[PDB]
Coordinates of C-alpha atoms and ligand atoms in Angstrom, one line a residue:
Chain A
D1 CA 16.8 7.9 24.6
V2 CA 18.0 7.3 21.4
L3 CA 15.2 8.5 19.2
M4 CA 14.6 6.8 16.1
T5 CA 13.7 9.1 12.6
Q6 CA 12.1 6.9 10.1
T7 CA 11.5 8.0 6.4
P8 CA 9.4 8.2 4.9
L9 CA 6.4 7.9 6.6
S10 CA 4.5 6.4 3.7
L11 CA 6.0 5.0 0.5
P12 CA 3.3 3.4 -1.5
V13 CA 5.1 1.6 -3.9
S14 CA 3.5 -1.3 -6.7
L15 CA 3.9 -5.0 -6.6
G16 CA 7.4 -6.2 -7.9
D17 CA 9.0 -2.7 -7.5
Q18 CA 12.3 -1.9 -5.0
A19 CA 11.5 0.6 -1.7
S20 CA 14.2 1.2 0.6
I21 CA 13.3 3.0 4.1
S22 CA 15.9 4.6 6.1
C23 CA 16.2 4.5 9.6
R24 CA 18.4 7.7 11.7
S25 CA 19.0 7.8 15.0
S26 CA 20.3 10.7 17.3
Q27 CA 23.5 9.7 18.4
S28 CA 25.7 7.0 17.7
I29 CA 24.9 3.1 18.4
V30 CA 27.5 1.3 17.6
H31 CA 28.8 -0.9 20.4
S32 CA 32.7 -0.7 21.7
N33 CA 32.5 -4.8 20.7
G34 CA 32.6 -4.5 17.1
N35 CA 28.9 -4.9 16.1
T36 CA 25.9 -3.0 16.4
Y37 CA 22.6 -4.4 17.6
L38 CA 19.6 -3.6 15.8
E39 CA 16.0 -5.4 14.8
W40 CA 13.2 -4.6 12.5
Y41 CA 9.9 -5.4 13.3
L42 CA 7.1 -6.3 10.8
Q43 CA 3.5 -5.9 11.9
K44 CA 0.2 -6.8 10.3
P45 CA -3.3 -6.0 11.2
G46 CA -4.4 -8.0 14.1
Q47 CA -1.7 -10.1 14.6
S48 CA 1.8 -10.6 16.5
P49 CA 4.6 -8.3 15.2
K50 CA 7.0 -10.8 13.0
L51 CA 11.0 -10.6 12.5
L52 CA 12.7 -10.1 9.7
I53 CA 16.1 -8.6 9.9
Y54 CA 18.3 -9.2 13.3
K55 CA 22.0 -7.7 13.4
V56 CA 20.9 -6.3 10.1
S57 CA 24.9 -7.7 8.5
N58 CA 22.9 -10.8 9.2
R59 CA 19.2 -12.4 7.7
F60 CA 16.5 -14.0 10.0
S61 CA 16.1 -18.2 9.7
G62 CA 12.8 -18.3 8.4
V63 CA 12.3 -15.6 6.3
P64 CA 12.6 -15.1 2.3
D65 CA 15.4 -13.7 0.3
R66 CA 13.7 -10.6 -0.7
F67 CA 14.2 -8.5 2.4
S68 CA 18.0 -6.9 3.1
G69 CA 19.7 -4.6 5.3
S70 CA 22.3 -2.3 4.9
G71 CA 23.8 1.2 6.0
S72 CA 26.9 2.5 8.2
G73 CA 27.7 3.2 11.6
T74 CA 25.0 5.6 11.7
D75 CA 22.0 5.3 8.5
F76 CA 20.7 2.0 8.2
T77 CA 18.3 1.2 5.4
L78 CA 16.1 -1.7 4.9
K79 CA 15.5 -2.5 1.2
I80 CA 12.5 -4.7 0.0
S81 CA 13.2 -6.0 -4.2
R82 CA 9.7 -7.2 -4.9
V83 CA 6.9 -6.4 -2.7
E84 CA 4.1 -9.2 -2.8
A85 CA 0.5 -9.1 -1.3
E86 CA 1.6 -10.7 1.7
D87 CA 4.4 -7.3 2.6
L88 CA 1.6 -5.6 3.7
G89 CA 2.0 -3.6 7.4
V90 CA 3.9 -1.6 9.4
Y91 CA 7.7 -1.4 9.9
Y92 CA 9.3 -0.7 13.6
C93 CA 12.9 0.0 14.2
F94 CA 14.5 -1.1 17.3
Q95 CA 18.0 0.2 19.0
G96 CA 19.8 -2.1 21.3
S97 CA 22.8 0.0 21.9
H98 CA 21.8 2.4 25.3
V99 CA 20.0 1.3 28.3
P100 CA 17.4 1.8 28.1
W101 CA 16.1 0.4 24.8
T102 CA 13.6 2.7 22.5
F103 CA 11.5 1.6 19.3
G104 CA 10.9 3.6 16.3
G105 CA 8.4 5.9 14.7
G106 CA 7.0 3.4 12.4
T107 CA 6.9 3.2 8.9
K108 CA 3.1 2.7 6.9
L109 CA 3.9 0.6 4.2
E110 CA 0.8 -0.5 1.4
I111 CA 0.8 -1.3 -2.0
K112 CA -0.2 1.6 -4.6
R113 CA -2.3 1.6 -8.1
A114 CA -3.8 4.1 -10.1
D115 CA -6.1 6.2 -9.2
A116 CA -10.0 5.5 -9.3
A117 CA -13.3 7.4 -9.1
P118 CA -15.3 8.0 -5.7
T119 CA -18.6 6.4 -5.2
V120 CA -20.5 9.0 -2.9
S121 CA -23.4 8.0 -0.9
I122 CA -26.0 9.9 1.7
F123 CA -28.6 8.1 3.9
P124 CA -30.9 10.1 6.0
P125 CA -32.3 8.9 8.7
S126 CA -35.1 6.1 9.2
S127 CA -38.6 5.7 10.4
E128 CA -37.9 3.8 13.5
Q129 CA -35.2 6.6 14.5
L130 CA -37.3 9.5 14.2
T131 CA -39.6 7.5 16.4
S132 CA -37.1 6.8 19.3
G133 CA -36.6 10.6 18.5
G134 CA -33.2 11.0 17.0
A135 CA -31.7 11.9 13.1
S136 CA -28.7 9.9 12.2
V137 CA -27.7 11.5 8.7
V138 CA -24.8 9.0 7.1
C139 CA -22.3 10.1 4.0
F140 CA -20.5 7.2 2.5
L141 CA -17.9 7.3 0.1
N142 CA -16.0 4.2 -0.8
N143 CA -13.5 3.2 -3.7
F144 CA -12.0 6.3 -3.8
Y145 CA -7.9 7.0 -4.5
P146 CA -5.8 8.3 -2.9
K147 CA -6.7 8.8 1.1
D148 CA -6.8 12.9 -0.2
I149 CA -10.3 13.9 -0.1
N150 CA -12.8 16.2 2.3
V151 CA -16.0 15.7 3.9
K152 CA -18.2 18.7 4.2
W153 CA -21.7 19.2 5.7
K154 CA -23.8 22.2 5.2
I155 CA -27.2 22.8 6.6
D156 CA -29.5 25.6 5.2
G157 CA -25.9 26.5 2.9
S158 CA -23.8 27.3 6.6
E159 CA -20.6 24.9 7.5
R160 CA -22.0 22.6 10.5
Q161 CA -18.8 21.1 12.4
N162 CA -20.3 19.7 15.7
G163 CA -21.6 16.1 15.6
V164 CA -19.6 15.2 12.8
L165 CA -17.6 11.8 13.3
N166 CA -15.1 10.9 10.4
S167 CA -14.3 6.6 10.3
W168 CA -12.2 4.8 7.4
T169 CA -10.3 2.2 6.8
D170 CA -7.2 0.8 5.4
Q171 CA -6.4 0.1 2.1
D172 CA -8.5 -3.5 0.6
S173 CA -7.2 -6.0 -0.7
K174 CA -9.5 -7.4 -3.3
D175 CA -9.7 -3.7 -5.3
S176 CA -6.7 -1.8 -3.8
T177 CA -9.2 1.5 -2.5
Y178 CA -10.6 3.6 0.1
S179 CA -13.4 4.1 2.2
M180 CA -14.4 6.9 4.3
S181 CA -18.1 7.4 6.6
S182 CA -18.9 10.9 8.0
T183 CA -22.0 10.2 11.0
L184 CA -24.1 13.3 12.0
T185 CA -26.1 12.9 14.9
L186 CA -29.1 15.4 15.9
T187 CA -32.2 15.6 17.3
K188 CA -35.7 15.3 15.9
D189 CA -36.7 18.6 16.9
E190 CA -33.8 20.0 15.3
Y191 CA -34.8 18.1 12.1
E192 CA -38.0 19.9 11.8
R193 CA -37.0 23.2 12.0
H194 CA -34.0 23.2 9.2
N195 CA -34.3 22.6 5.5
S196 CA -31.6 21.4 3.3
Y197 CA -29.2 18.6 4.8
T198 CA -26.0 18.3 2.2
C199 CA -23.1 16.4 2.1
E200 CA -20.5 17.9 -0.4
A201 CA -16.9 16.0 -1.2
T202 CA -13.6 17.6 -2.5
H203 CA -11.1 15.1 -4.2
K204 CA -8.1 15.4 -6.4
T205 CA -9.7 13.3 -9.5
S206 CA -13.1 15.7 -9.6
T207 CA -12.9 18.9 -10.4
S208 CA -16.0 20.4 -8.8
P209 CA -17.5 18.5 -5.3
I210 CA -20.0 15.9 -5.5
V211 CA -23.0 17.2 -4.0
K212 CA -26.0 15.2 -2.2
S213 CA -28.0 17.5 -0.7
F214 CA -31.7 16.6 0.7
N215 CA -34.7 18.8 2.1
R216 CA -36.8 18.1 4.8
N217 CA -40.1 19.1 3.5
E218 CA -39.1 19.1 0.0
Chain B
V1 CA 7.8 -22.7 23.5
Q2 CA 4.6 -21.2 24.4
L3 CA 3.5 -18.4 25.8
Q4 CA -0.1 -17.5 27.5
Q5 CA -1.9 -14.2 28.5
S6 CA -4.9 -12.9 30.8
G7 CA -8.4 -12.7 29.2
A8 CA -9.8 -9.0 28.2
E9 CA -10.1 -6.9 31.1
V10 CA -12.4 -3.8 32.1
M11 CA -12.4 -1.4 35.2
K12 CA -13.6 2.2 36.1
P13 CA -10.6 4.6 36.1
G14 CA -8.4 5.4 38.5
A15 CA -8.2 1.1 39.7
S16 CA -5.4 -1.3 39.5
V17 CA -5.5 -3.9 37.1
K18 CA -3.7 -7.4 37.0
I19 CA -2.4 -9.3 33.6
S20 CA -0.7 -12.6 33.8
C21 CA 1.9 -14.0 31.8
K22 CA 2.2 -17.4 31.4
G23 CA 5.6 -18.8 30.0
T24 CA 6.0 -22.5 28.8
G25 CA 8.7 -24.6 26.8
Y26 CA 11.8 -22.8 28.1
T27 CA 14.1 -22.0 31.0
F28 CA 11.6 -19.0 32.2
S29 CA 13.9 -17.8 34.8
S30 CA 17.1 -17.7 33.0
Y31 CA 16.6 -14.4 30.8
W32 CA 14.9 -11.4 30.2
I33 CA 10.9 -10.8 29.6
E34 CA 9.7 -7.3 28.1
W35 CA 6.3 -6.1 27.7
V36 CA 5.1 -3.7 25.0
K37 CA 2.2 -1.3 24.6
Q38 CA 0.3 -0.5 21.4
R39 CA -2.2 2.3 21.2
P40 CA -5.0 1.4 18.6
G41 CA -3.7 4.5 17.1
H42 CA -0.1 4.3 16.3
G43 CA 2.6 3.5 17.3
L44 CA 4.9 1.3 20.0
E45 CA 6.2 2.3 23.7
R46 CA 7.9 0.0 25.5
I47 CA 6.7 -0.6 29.5
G48 CA 10.0 -2.1 30.6
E49 CA 11.6 -6.0 31.2
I50 CA 12.5 -8.1 33.8
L51 CA 14.5 -11.0 35.1
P52 CA 12.5 -13.9 36.3
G53 CA 15.2 -15.0 38.6
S54 CA 17.0 -12.0 40.7
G55 CA 15.2 -8.8 41.6
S56 CA 16.1 -6.9 38.7
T57 CA 14.0 -3.6 37.2
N58 CA 14.0 -1.5 35.1
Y59 CA 11.4 1.8 33.7
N60 CA 11.5 4.0 30.4
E61 CA 12.0 7.3 31.7
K62 CA 8.7 8.1 30.8
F63 CA 6.0 5.5 32.3
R64 CA 8.0 5.5 35.8
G65 CA 5.9 5.0 38.6
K66 CA 3.0 3.9 36.6
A67 CA 3.3 0.1 36.5
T68 CA 5.8 -2.3 39.0
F69 CA 6.7 -6.1 37.9
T70 CA 6.9 -9.3 39.5
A71 CA 8.0 -12.5 38.9
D72 CA 7.4 -15.9 40.7
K73 CA 9.8 -18.6 40.4
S74 CA 7.8 -22.0 41.9
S75 CA 5.2 -21.0 39.1
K76 CA 6.0 -19.6 36.0
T77 CA 4.2 -16.5 36.0
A78 CA 4.8 -12.8 35.8
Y79 CA 2.5 -10.5 36.9
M80 CA 2.2 -6.7 37.1
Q81 CA 0.5 -4.0 39.8
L82 CA -0.8 -1.1 37.6
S83 CA -1.3 2.7 39.5
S84 CA -3.8 4.9 38.6
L85 CA -5.1 4.6 35.7
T86 CA -5.9 7.4 33.2
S87 CA -8.3 7.3 30.1
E88 CA -4.9 7.7 28.1
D89 CA -3.5 4.3 28.2
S90 CA -6.2 2.3 27.7
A91 CA -4.3 0.3 24.7
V92 CA -3.3 -3.2 23.8
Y93 CA -0.5 -4.9 25.6
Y94 CA 2.0 -7.4 24.4
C95 CA 4.4 -9.4 25.8
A96 CA 7.6 -11.0 24.9
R97 CA 11.3 -12.8 25.3
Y98 CA 14.3 -11.1 25.3
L99 CA 17.9 -11.6 25.9
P100 CA 20.1 -8.6 25.1
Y101 CA 23.8 -8.6 23.3
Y102 CA 22.7 -11.6 21.5
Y103 CA 20.0 -13.8 19.9
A104 CA 16.7 -12.1 21.0
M105 CA 12.5 -11.7 20.2
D106 CA 11.9 -15.2 18.7
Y107 CA 8.4 -15.2 19.7
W108 CA 5.8 -13.3 21.4
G109 CA 2.4 -13.8 22.8
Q110 CA -1.7 -13.5 21.6
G111 CA -2.6 -10.0 22.9
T112 CA -4.1 -9.1 25.8
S113 CA -6.8 -5.7 25.4
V114 CA -7.3 -3.7 28.2
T115 CA -10.9 -1.5 27.8
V116 CA -11.1 1.0 30.9
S117 CA -14.5 3.2 30.8
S118 CA -16.6 4.1 33.5
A119 CA -19.8 3.1 31.7
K120 CA -21.6 0.3 32.0
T121 CA -22.1 -2.8 29.4
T122 CA -25.1 -2.0 27.5
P123 CA -27.0 -3.9 24.9
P124 CA -26.7 -2.5 21.6
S125 CA -29.5 -1.0 19.8
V126 CA -29.5 -1.6 16.1
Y127 CA -31.2 0.8 13.4
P128 CA -31.4 0.5 9.6
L129 CA -30.4 3.3 6.9
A130 CA -33.0 4.4 4.2
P131 CA -31.8 6.5 1.3
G132 CA -34.6 9.8 1.1
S133 CA -37.9 9.5 -0.4
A134 CA -37.1 11.3 -3.3
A135 CA -33.9 10.1 -4.7
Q136 CA -32.5 9.2 -9.1
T137 CA -32.6 5.6 -9.1
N138 CA -28.9 4.9 -10.1
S139 CA -27.6 1.9 -12.1
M140 CA -26.6 0.7 -8.1
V141 CA -27.4 1.6 -4.5
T142 CA -25.6 1.3 -1.6
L143 CA -27.3 0.0 1.9
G144 CA -27.1 0.7 5.5
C145 CA -26.9 -1.0 8.8
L146 CA -26.2 0.7 12.3
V147 CA -25.3 0.0 15.7
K148 CA -24.9 2.2 18.6
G149 CA -24.5 1.8 22.1
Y150 CA -22.7 -0.8 23.2
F151 CA -20.2 -1.9 25.5
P152 CA -17.6 -3.2 25.3
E153 CA -15.9 -4.5 22.0
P154 CA -16.7 -6.6 19.3
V155 CA -19.7 -6.9 17.7
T156 CA -20.3 -8.6 14.9
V157 CA -22.3 -6.8 11.7
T158 CA -23.1 -9.2 9.1
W159 CA -25.3 -9.4 5.8
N160 CA -27.8 -12.8 5.6
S161 CA -25.3 -15.8 5.8
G162 CA -23.0 -14.4 3.9
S163 CA -25.0 -14.1 0.8
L164 CA -23.9 -10.2 0.5
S165 CA -20.7 -10.8 0.8
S166 CA -18.7 -8.9 -1.6
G167 CA -18.5 -5.0 -1.9
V168 CA -18.8 -4.9 2.1
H169 CA -17.6 -2.0 4.2
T170 CA -17.6 -2.1 8.0
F171 CA -15.3 0.2 9.6
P172 CA -13.2 0.8 12.9
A173 CA -14.5 1.4 16.2
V174 CA -14.8 5.1 16.9
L175 CA -16.6 7.2 20.1
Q176 CA -19.2 9.9 20.2
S177 CA -19.5 10.7 23.8
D178 CA -19.0 7.4 25.7
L179 CA -20.2 4.4 23.7
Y180 CA -19.3 3.0 19.9
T181 CA -21.5 4.0 16.8
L182 CA -20.7 1.6 13.8
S183 CA -22.2 1.3 10.8
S184 CA -21.9 -1.5 7.9
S185 CA -22.7 -1.0 4.2
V186 CA -22.5 -3.0 1.0
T187 CA -23.0 -2.2 -2.7
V188 CA -26.0 -3.9 -4.6
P189 CA -27.7 -3.6 -8.3
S190 CA -30.7 -1.2 -8.5
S191 CA -32.7 -3.6 -10.3
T192 CA -32.8 -6.3 -7.2
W193 CA -33.5 -4.3 -4.2
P194 CA -37.1 -3.8 -4.8
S195 CA -37.2 -7.7 -5.2
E196 CA -34.7 -9.4 -3.1
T197 CA -35.3 -9.7 1.0
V198 CA -32.1 -8.5 2.6
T199 CA -31.9 -8.1 6.7
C200 CA -28.9 -7.3 8.6
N201 CA -27.8 -9.3 11.3
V202 CA -26.1 -8.0 14.8
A203 CA -24.2 -10.7 17.1
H204 CA -23.3 -9.4 20.3
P205 CA -21.3 -12.3 22.1
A206 CA -20.7 -10.3 24.9
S207 CA -23.8 -9.6 25.9
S208 CA -25.4 -12.5 23.8
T209 CA -27.5 -10.4 21.6
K210 CA -28.9 -11.7 18.3
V211 CA -30.6 -9.3 15.9
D212 CA -31.6 -9.2 12.8
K213 CA -33.2 -6.0 11.3
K214 CA -34.9 -5.6 7.6
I215 CA -34.4 -2.7 5.5
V216 CA -37.4 -1.8 3.8
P217 CA -38.1 1.6 1.1
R218 CA -40.0 4.6 1.5
Chain C
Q1 CA 62.4 -6.6 31.4
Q2 CA 62.7 -9.2 33.5
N3 CA 64.4 -12.3 33.3
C4 CA 63.1 -15.7 35.4
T5 CA 64.6 -19.3 35.0
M6 CA 62.7 -22.5 35.9
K7 CA 65.1 -25.9 36.5
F8 CA 63.2 -29.0 35.6
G9 CA 64.6 -32.1 35.9
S10 CA 64.9 -35.7 37.2
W11 CA 65.8 -36.6 40.6
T12 CA 67.0 -40.1 41.6
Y13 CA 68.5 -41.1 37.9
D14 CA 71.7 -40.3 36.6
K15 CA 72.4 -39.6 32.7
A16 CA 72.9 -43.4 32.4
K17 CA 69.7 -44.0 33.3
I18 CA 67.3 -40.9 32.4
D19 CA 68.0 -38.7 29.4
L20 CA 66.0 -35.4 29.0
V21 CA 65.4 -34.3 25.3
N22 CA 63.9 -30.7 24.9
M23 CA 60.5 -31.5 22.2
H24 CA 60.4 -28.3 21.4
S25 CA 63.3 -25.7 21.0
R26 CA 60.7 -22.8 22.0
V27 CA 58.0 -23.1 24.5
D28 CA 54.1 -23.3 22.8
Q29 CA 52.2 -20.2 23.3
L30 CA 48.7 -21.4 21.2
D31 CA 46.7 -21.1 24.7
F32 CA 48.5 -18.4 26.2
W33 CA 46.4 -16.1 28.1
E34 CA 47.1 -11.6 27.9
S35 CA 47.1 -11.1 31.4
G36 CA 47.6 -7.6 30.2
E37 CA 50.0 -5.9 32.5
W38 CA 53.0 -8.8 31.6
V39 CA 53.5 -10.1 27.1
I40 CA 56.1 -12.9 27.3
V41 CA 59.1 -11.5 24.8
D42 CA 60.7 -14.9 24.5
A43 CA 61.1 -18.3 26.5
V44 CA 64.4 -20.4 25.5
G45 CA 65.0 -24.1 26.5
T46 CA 68.7 -25.4 27.4
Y47 CA 69.7 -28.9 28.4
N48 CA 72.8 -28.8 30.8
Chain D
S1 CA 21.0 -43.0 31.4
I2 CA 22.8 -41.1 33.9
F3 CA 22.0 -37.7 35.5
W4 CA 24.8 -36.2 37.9
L5 CA 24.9 -32.7 39.6
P6 CA 27.7 -32.2 41.4
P7 CA 28.4 -28.9 43.5
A8 CA 31.5 -26.8 43.0
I9 CA 33.2 -23.6 43.6
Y10 CA 35.1 -21.6 40.7
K11 CA 37.6 -19.1 40.1
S12 CA 37.6 -18.2 36.7
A13 CA 40.0 -15.7 35.1
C14 CA 38.1 -12.9 33.3
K15 CA 40.2 -9.7 31.9
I16 CA 38.3 -6.4 32.9
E17 CA 37.2 -4.4 30.6
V18 CA 37.9 -1.2 32.7
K19 CA 36.9 2.1 30.3
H20 CA 33.8 3.5 32.0
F21 CA 34.3 3.6 35.4
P22 CA 32.6 2.7 37.7
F23 CA 29.3 1.9 35.8
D24 CA 30.1 -0.5 33.0
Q25 CA 29.4 -3.8 31.8
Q26 CA 32.3 -7.1 32.6
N27 CA 32.5 -10.0 30.0
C28 CA 33.8 -13.0 31.9
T29 CA 34.3 -16.2 29.6
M30 CA 34.3 -19.0 31.2
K31 CA 35.3 -22.8 29.0
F32 CA 34.2 -26.0 29.8
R33 CA 36.3 -29.1 28.0
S34 CA 37.2 -32.6 29.3
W35 CA 41.2 -33.0 29.5
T36 CA 41.0 -36.8 29.4
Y37 CA 38.9 -37.0 26.4
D38 CA 38.7 -35.4 22.9
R39 CA 36.6 -35.5 20.3
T40 CA 37.3 -39.0 19.2
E41 CA 35.5 -40.9 21.7
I42 CA 33.1 -38.2 23.3
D43 CA 31.3 -35.6 22.1
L44 CA 29.5 -32.3 23.9
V45 CA 26.2 -30.5 23.3
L46 CA 24.1 -28.0 25.4
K47 CA 20.4 -28.8 26.3
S48 CA 19.5 -25.7 27.0
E49 CA 21.3 -22.4 25.3
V50 CA 20.6 -20.6 28.7
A51 CA 22.1 -21.1 31.8
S52 CA 19.1 -21.9 34.0
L53 CA 19.4 -19.5 37.2
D54 CA 16.3 -21.3 39.3
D55 CA 18.3 -21.6 42.3
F56 CA 19.9 -18.1 41.8
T57 CA 20.1 -15.4 44.6
Ligands
LIG1 C1 32.3 -11.2 25.5 O1 33.4 -12.1 25.2 C2 33.0 -12.7 24.1 C3 34.5 -13.7 23.7 O2 35.1 -12.7 22.7 C4 32.5 -12.3 22.8 O3 32.3 -13.4 21.7 C5 32.6 -12.6 20.4 O4 32.0 -12.4 20.0 C6 32.7 -11.7 18.8 C7 31.7 -10.6 18.2 O5 30.4 -10.7 18.0 C8 32.0 -12.9 18.0 O6 32.5 -12.9 16.6 C9 32.0 -13.0 15.4 O7 32.2 -15.1 15.5 C10 30.9 -15.5 14.5 C11 31.2 -16.6 13.9 O8 30.5 -17.3 13.3 C12 30.7 -14.5 13.2 O9 29.7 -14.8 12.3 C13 30.9 -12.9 13.5 O10 31.2 -11.7 12.5 C14 32.1 -12.5 14.6 O11 33.1 -12.5 13.8 C15 33.3 -14.4 18.4 O12 32.5 -14.6 17.7 C16 32.5 -14.3 19.8 N1 33.9 -14.8 20.4 C17 33.3 -16.7 20.7 C18 32.1 -16.6 20.8 O13 34.3 -17.1 21.6 C19 31.6 -11.3 23.2 O14 30.7 -10.6 21.9 C20 31.2 -10.3 24.3 N2 30.1 -10.1 24.9 C21 29.7 -9.1 24.3 C22 28.4 -8.0 24.8 O15 30.3 -8.1 22.9
LIG2 C1 68.7 -14.7 31.6 O1 69.0 -15.7 32.2 C2 69.9 -16.4 31.5 C3 70.3 -17.3 32.6 O2 71.6 -16.7 33.5 C4 70.8 -16.4 30.4 O3 71.4 -17.2 29.9 C5 70.6 -15.9 29.3 O4 70.6 -14.9 28.7 C6 69.7 -14.0 29.9 N1 68.8 -13.3 29.3 C7 68.6 -12.4 29.1 C8 68.4 -11.4 28.3 O5 69.9 -11.9 29.2
LIG3 C1 71.2 -36.4 42.0 N1 69.5 -35.5 43.1 C2 69.9 -34.1 42.9 C3 70.2 -33.4 44.3 C4 69.8 -34.7 45.1 C5 70.8 -35.7 44.1 C6 70.1 -37.1 44.5 C7 71.3 -38.5 45.0 C8 70.8 -39.4 45.4 C9 69.3 -39.7 45.3 N2 68.6 -38.8 44.9 C10 68.6 -37.3 44.5

């Protein structure tokens, strides 16, 4: 199988800027007839992929002219002139030379803007969960950029990693920010034997890690 | 042209899964139909194509012996017998039309979700996320509504009929042991929370679970 | 090189009744199909 | 409207692109044309892009 290499993996660009993405094959994919057969696919979150560039030297019937494709017999490059709010998504390559056919690696593409200050919050468990017999300590971090950020859990000064769940979404549309939750589930009996629970955050926009701690017995 | 697929499919691991593909508006028995596997994490991997006219089948060298296609000529329908299924194959399945060396991939399907698990359909468990007793009153405060232990996806966690829709945050589903744990948050002013009544609502259509839950200070 | 001749003509009429005139000096090759092994060097027409 | 389908057997002549023997791809082209009328009285248009194979074995 002829594997695809997509470069880069992520190219955050601003609105209106020109972006070029390379898609290389391990082998020659030029057919003996004299035409190279490759497909470009654009997939949006929660929808079926769309068509923009088939038979690279040509253009799909229905896609605007802002997309273009070029390259030599082996190296291929997809170019966008002005990135709009609709161009968010993931690119994919599809070679059509040899049997069987295979896909690419998938190139993540979103927009880029300036840096933002992270908003950190911590939530101790509620009384209903205490009556149930559990303890879910949550740590939200909203409206931060870029994704380079680390979350750490401390129990009485000791690092804790078991039971930590990290979740994050994509780049939002109205504010272009990132969000991340860290959830820690423990037993209620363990909640009454320790003293201090702390969520700490390290981000590029903060020289000191943002600390949010709370004590059981205060 | 128009494509139809089967509904959601759940099954215990080790058994077989059958999904149906219906095609109308064109000559169904004239050119290739290929299916695509998308892991919910990343990447696109193909599974194979078939020619509904003859008994021509081929498979990717990685997914050999995992599935076996079949097509009907009387009824325009394609099926796929699936072999012993493992928890590493729970992904989304697409179908598409294709004709090699020429115009190809002009339409798609809608998406088939296959969720294989050994668990059983359990109703959700809703919980609040109340801040600590000792905390500094800032200008704004974040909220939290958690749902643990439900199957299968999806669920709808909203605020009061869309009243608090700005700055909301709902994260993707992540497992802990065998079920899902999902939190929803939103930022509100601090001068309004002690006065306005807010209640997070949870709707699960697969289990018909409509539960509202109010968050109260300590 | 192969030199092969085809002889066309009338059968039941003399020159006093039917007289043939070649429309083209050379044989047309606008829709020729290249067999691959044989290529036509030339095709000449003669009136006798 | 008239809808007419006569069966037939055809012996087309297509060049053999024999480079990768034996496995390979053969490209055989076959033309349809009206020998009697040119594009002055009739015009030909394809109903479907692909040759239907409903009856193929
Ligand atoms: C099998 O043989 C046929 C007949 O030769 C091949 O069709 C020919 O393919 C070539 C190359 O794709 C076509 O050239 C193209 O013509 C269009 C005209 O619109 C032009 O836009 C392109 O830039 C290119 O020059 C040629 O037209 C076509 N011959 C026809 C349709 O009569 C076919 O490609 C062969 N099969 C394979 C897999 O190659
Ligand atoms: C082919 O034969 C014809 C008839 O004998 C003759 O007139 C002509 O010169 C020949 N062509 C060549 C190239 O010898
Ligand atoms: C002139 N033709 C050529 C050979 C036979 C001859 C002929 C004579 C009379 C009637 N038919 C044919």
